Amino acid sequence: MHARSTGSYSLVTQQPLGGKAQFGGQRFGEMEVWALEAYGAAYTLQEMLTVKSDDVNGRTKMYKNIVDGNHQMEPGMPESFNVLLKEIRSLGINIELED
């Protein structure tokens, strides 16, 4: 048995999931987002992808909102995507979020 509400995070700002060793969060694997989006559930998928995993600003804003009785959500951008952007830019390939 294990559970986690908020703990440590890695360099990619995801939770380490050392299991019970370092208070890890259960991984929402690739085959689970398929089932989440097969239901047509978009908002749950968005919150699991951004607010509970990588959006550090989203994380702190959501935590502050919950204790105040509000249940809003700021989507933001996951930090894993920015890490990937920097990784690809490091190979001389230009990645840009053009508007």
């Binding site: 047509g40 908002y43 009785g69 509000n70 249940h71 809003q72």
Partner: protein, 79 residues
């Protein structure tokens, strides 16, 4: 402790915009000072909004017209 959604789905057939309208109504209740229309009995705002949608007194057009009335009241207080 509502167990089914089918009866509320009959009001809004898509069952996908039902989530959107119910979320909007529940956000209106729990964030603003709005008090529920259907009587409340120690229930979360989720089920309160769903029960209102079931009774037929809440719809997307109803929410839109209510928002228009609040906008008119707000602009009236300005002058």
């Amino acid at each position: 402790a509502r167990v089914t959604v089918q009866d509320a789905v009959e009001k809004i057939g898509n069952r996908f915009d039902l989530v959107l309208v119910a979320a909007r109504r529940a956000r209106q209740m729990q964030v603003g000072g709005k008090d529920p229309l259907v009587p409340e009995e120690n229930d979360k705002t989720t089920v309160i909004a769903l029960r209102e949608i079931e009774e037929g007194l809440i719809n997307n057009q109803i929410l839109d017209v209510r928002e228009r009335q609040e906008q008119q009241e707000q602009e009236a207080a300005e002058l």
